[PDB]
Amino acid sequence: GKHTVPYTISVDGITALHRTYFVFPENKKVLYQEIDSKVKNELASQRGVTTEKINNAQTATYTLTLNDGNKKVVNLKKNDDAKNSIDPSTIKQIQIVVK
């Protein structure tokens, strides 16, 4: 019913909280913008990394590792694929990185 996706946050080479997960309703497609939103939300609440902080960072991205082992990197500063859709059920893990 609910798809859990473990995620980690790295900022300036450091990581804080452990075993944190995003939750998505099973097999219901979402726009990447929705995942972008959940990601920015946590960056802000857990690391105090606001939208303004993302825009001024050298690099700000999140890497999706899909169930089949492949990966897809999304740029948080400007996500062209913000319109594209994806089945969250295909996502195994998310690695958020900002520097």
* The dihedral formed by the CA atoms of 77, 78, 84 and 88, expressed in degrees to the nearest 10: 0
Does 68 contact Zn ion by CB under 5 A? yes
Q: Is 57 left (phi over 0), alpha (psi -120 to 50) or beta?
A: beta
Q: Which residue has its beta carbon closest to Zn ion?
A: 3
Does 3 contact Zn ion by CB under 5 A? yes
Stretch that binds Zn ion, among 8-16, 40-48, 59-67, 78-86 (CB under 5 A): 59-67
Between 6 and 82, name the residue whose CB sits nearer to Zn ion. 6
- CA atoms lying within 13 Å on the CB side of residue 58: 4
Least distance between Zn ion and beta carbon 71 (Å): 10
Site residues, Zn ion (CB under 5 A): 3, 66, 68
